[PDB]
C-alpha cells in the first residue's frame, strides 16, 4: 500500500504545515501538523476543555462506530517551544492520503496549552519520530508510520515541504518526479528517538564550504533552523545590521536586507537554502526589524533541521530495520 497527502502552510510565513487526516467511521477529517520530532498522534476532541478550543475542528469518538476507549491509558507531552497537551486515548481507524491503519492510538486532548488554543488552523499533531518517544502510559503506543510500515510497498515516508506553497507527504514510495539529481542517504541514530543525523558542514552565501560535523534532527514540526552559535554567528555576520536580541529572543535583521543563502552538507552533497527562506518577516506588525530563520541552538541542547532547511529538499525518512535519511535538491 501507499498514501499521498498534500500539506499546506498555515500562514504566509510557513510557520507550520497542516495535512488532512481521516479519523473514525464515518470519517472525521482533521488538519494535523505532521511532526517528525515527536511520536504522539493527538487531536482536539469533544473531551477538550471548552475554554481551550477556539476554532479547531474536533474529533468526537462517540460519533465513530470504530472508536474504542483504550481503557486506563493517558498521555501528556511537552514540546521544545514550551507548549503541552494531555488527555486519554482511543483506538480508531486513521487514513492519510488513502493509506489506512486500523487500531491506531488517537490521543484525545483534555487539556492543551495556550499556543495550541490560539492556533485555530491546527487540529492536532501526527508524530513521525520513533515510537520510543510516545508518551502513552502505561502501555506505549506506536506511531501511524510504525503501524503502517509492514503494509507499505517500501518502509519509508517522504517530506516535500513547499516554500510559501503546498507540498506533499508520501508513504510507502519515493516519487522520482519530485526531486532533481540523485538522493544522498546518510546514517541515522535512533538513540534519542529522533531522526538524528550528522551534516558534513555548511557554507554562507557564495563562501567556501566549512567541513565540520553537525549532529542534529530532521524535524518537520519545528519552523526554523537551529544550529551551533558559531555557525549562526558566521551567517548573520554577512547581513549588515543583523544582531542577536535577547528582547525578541533571536537574531533579527533589517527588513531592507537581502539575505544570503545557507548551504548544508549531506555527505558529499549540498542542499542550498535560498536567502528568502530565512526571512520570517517583521517581528511585530509594521516593524522594520525582521526575524531570522536561522537561530542558535545553544539554549536547546540539540541542533534542529526544521522546516527552513527541510523545505529546501526532498527528504526521505527510511524506516527500514536500520533507518536512514535521504536528501535531494528539488
Ligand atoms: C556518509 C553518508 O552520507 N552515508 C553513509 C551510508 C548511509 C546508508 C546506510 C545504509 C544504507 C544506505 C545508506 C553513512 O552515513 O554511513
Ligand atoms: Na515567533
Curated annotation (Swiss-Prot):
The chain holds residues 90 to 419 of 419 of the full protein. It comes from Cryphonectria parasitica. Keywords: Aspartyl protease, Disulfide bond, Hydrolase, Protease, Signal, Zymogen. Belongs to the peptidase A1 family. The keyword GTP-binding does not apply. The lineage of its organism: Eukaryota, Fungi, Dikarya, Ascomycota, Pezizomycotina. One of its GO terms (molecular function) is aspartic-type endopeptidase activity. The active site is at residues 35, 199. GO terms for biological process: proteolysis. Transmembrane segments: none annotated. It catalyses: Hydrolysis of proteins with specificity similar to that of pepsin A, prefers hydrophobic residues at P1 and P1', but does not cleave 14-Ala-|-Leu-15 in the B chain of insulin or Z-Glu-Tyr. Clots milk. Residues 17-328 form the Peptidase A1 domain. Disulfide bonds join 255-290. It is an enzyme of class 3 (hydrolase). Its EC number is 3.4.23.22. This is Endothiapepsin.
Amino acid at each position: 500500500s501507499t498514501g499521498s497527502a498534500t500539506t499546506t502552510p498555515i500562514d504566509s510565513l510557513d510557520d507550520a504545515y497542516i495535512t488532512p487526516v481521516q479519523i473514525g467511521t464515518p470519517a472525521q477529517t482533521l488538519n494535523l501538523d505532521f511532526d517528525t520530532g515527536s511520536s504522539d498522534l493527538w487531536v482536539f476532541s469533544s473531551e477538550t476543555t471548552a475554554s481551550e478550543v477556539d476554532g479547531q475542528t474536533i474529533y468526537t469518538p462517540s460519533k465513530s462506530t470504530t472508536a474504542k476507549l483504550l481503557s486506563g491509558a493517558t498521555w501528556s507531552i511537552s514540546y521544545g517551544d514550551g507548549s503541552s497537551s494531555s488527555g486519554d486515548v482511543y483506538t480508531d481507524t486513521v487514513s492519510v492520503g488513502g493509506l489506512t491503519v486500523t487500531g491506531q492510538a488517537v490521543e484525545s486532548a483534555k487539556k492543551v496549552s495556550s499556543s495550541f488554543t490560539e492556533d485555530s488552523t491546527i487540529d492536532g499533531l501526527l508524530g513521525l519520530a520513533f515510537s520510543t518517544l510516545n508518551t502513552v502510559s502505561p502501555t506505549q503506543q506506536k506511531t501511524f508510520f510504525d503501524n503502517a510500515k509492514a503494509s507499505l510497498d517500501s518502509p519509508v515516508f517522504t517530506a516535500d515541504l513547499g516554500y510559501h506553497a503546498p507540498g506533499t507527504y508520501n508513504f510507502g514510495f519515493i516519487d522520482t518526479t519530485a526531486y532533481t539529481g540523485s538522493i544522498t542517504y546518510t546514517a541515522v541514530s535512533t538513540k534519542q528517538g529522533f531522526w538524528e543525523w550528522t551534516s558534513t558542514g555548511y557554507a554562507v552565501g557564495s563562501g567556501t564550504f566549512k567541513s565540520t560535523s553537525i549532529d542534529g534532527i530532521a524535524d518537520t514540526g519545528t519552523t526554523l533552523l537551529y544550529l551551533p552559535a558559531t555557525v549562526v554567528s558566521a551567517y548573520w555576520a554577512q547581513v549588515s545590521g543583523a544582531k542577536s536580541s535577547s528582547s525578541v529572543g533571536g537574531y533579527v535583521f533589517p527588513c531592507s536586507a537581502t539575505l544570503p543563502s545557507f548551504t548544508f552538507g549531506v555527505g558529499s552533497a549540498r542542499i542550498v537554502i535560498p536567502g528568502d527562506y530565512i526571512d520570517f518577516g517583521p517581528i511585530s506588525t509594521g516593524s522594520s526589524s525582521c526575524f531570522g530563520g536561522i537561530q542558535s541552538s545553544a539554549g536547546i541542547g540539540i541542533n534542529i533541521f526544521g522546516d527552513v532547511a527541510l523545505k529546501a529538499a526532498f527528504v526521505v525518512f527510511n524506516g527500514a530495520t536500520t533507518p536512514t535519511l535521504g536528501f535531494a535538491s528539488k
